[PDB]
Amino acid sequence: MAEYGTLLQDLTNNITLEDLEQLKSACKEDIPSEKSEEITTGSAWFSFLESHNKLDKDNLSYIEHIFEISRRPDLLTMVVDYRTRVLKISEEDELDTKLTRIPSAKKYKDIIRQPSEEEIIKLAPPPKKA
């Protein structure tokens, strides 16, 4: 999920305001013009997209299309290459399986799973004054 954030950020880094409008132009059919006005960045778009059902942490099919229909294979390439690269890392077997709440396979949330890994938390370099 983090790589995905950076992925979008990476193409966003290569995303020009002009290029975005091209994406937006292509997205005129998928994304509303009322929101296109505030899409001054790939981040602004992805954020809107994220805020909406246009872009999940792993769903880039619609965006990858934008990058495809638009004449900017450089951004698409990052998304495309990332798709496989992160997929090659996060080699999930239950990706094709639509099983959600399956205590017989999937793990329930009755157990409290904390995301704060305080074990390897000392490896972070925060800008706090000593």
Swiss-Prot record:
Highest taxon in the source lineage: Eukaryota
UniProt feature coiled coil, ranges: none
Pfam families, alphabetized: DED
List of residues that carry Phosphoserine: 61, 90, 104, 116
Organism per entry: Cricetulus griseus
Keywords (A to Z) from UniProt: Apoptosis, Cytoplasm, Phosphoprotein, Sugar transport, Transport
This protein's name: Astrocytic phosphoprotein PEA-15
Function noted in UniProt: Inhibits both TNFRSF6- and TNFRSF1A-mediated CASP8 activity and apoptosis. Regulates glucose transport by controlling both the content of SLC2A1 glucose transporters on the plasma membrane and the insulin-dependent trafficking of SLC2A4 from the cell interior to the surface. Blocks Ras-mediated inhibition of integrin activation and modulates the ERK MAP kinase cascade. Inhibits RPS6KA3 activities by retaining it in the cytoplasm.
Subcellular localization(s) per the UniProt record: Cytoplasm
GO cellular component terms, A-Z: cytosol; nucleoplasm
Region Microtubule-binding: start-end pairs: 98-107, 122-129
PANTHER family on file: ASTROCYTIC PHOSPHOPROTEIN PEA-15, DED DOMAIN-CONTAINING PROTEIN
Assembly: Interacts with CASP8 and FADD. Transient interaction with PLD1 and PLD2. Binds RPS6KA3, MAPK1 and MAPK3.
DED domain mapped to chain residues: 3-81
Primary location: cytoplasm
GO biological process, any: positive regulation of extrinsic apoptotic signaling pathway via death domain receptors
UniProt PTM comment: Phosphorylated by protein kinase C and calcium-calmodulin-dependent protein kinase. These phosphorylation events are modulated by neurotransmitters or hormones.
